[PDB]
């Protein structure tokens, strides 16, 4: 959203500066890892459907079953199909909208719509 830095003044002595989002290149940043962060807009990805297994791995089934309607899925293609059928997000006569539902799921995951996190280091 922020394309260029801007100066903001508070307390008359300290000025706030916000720069665009910076990502360091690295071969270990395979697209799956980058996408689940807020780095990339999911709109431009070619195949959002293939990322659903990643969000399944990163989130417990309980959280989705609560946020997302009827559950019990395996072979997440089935999950996408069932969610599209339930939500009416289906293409014309009558295939489910695989791309749209997956894109919406990724948007929800990245924008904090569903609860998820990474376990902190071992307590000591």
């Amino acid at each position: 959203e922020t394309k260029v830095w801007q100066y903001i003044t508070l307390m008359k002595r300290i000025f706030l500066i916000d720069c665009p989002g910076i990502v360091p290149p690295s071969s270990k940043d395979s697209e799956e890892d980058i996408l689940f962060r807020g780095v990339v807009r999911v709109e431009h990805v070619t195949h959002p459907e293939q990322y659903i297994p990643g969000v399944l791995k990163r989130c417990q089934v309980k959280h989705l079953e609560r946020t997302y309607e009827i559950s019990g899925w395996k072979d997440a293609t089935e999950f996408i199909e069932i969610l599209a059928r339930k939500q009416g997000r289906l293409l014309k006569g009558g295939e489910p909208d695989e791309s749209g539902v997956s894109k919406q799921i990724l948007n929800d995951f990245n924008r904090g719509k569903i609860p998820w996190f990474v376990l902190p280091p071992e307590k000591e």
Binding site: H63, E65, R66, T67, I70, S71, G112, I114
Partner: peptide, 24 residues
């Protein structure tokens, strides 16, 4: 650094945490 009171900051009531919806 001052003390941090994490008892505040009421966590956002995401629909996932709520038990009102279930599918068991």
């Amino acid at each position: 650094m001052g003390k941090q009171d994490l008892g505040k900051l009421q966590t956002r009531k995401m629909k996932g945490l709520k038990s009102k919806f279930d599918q068991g």
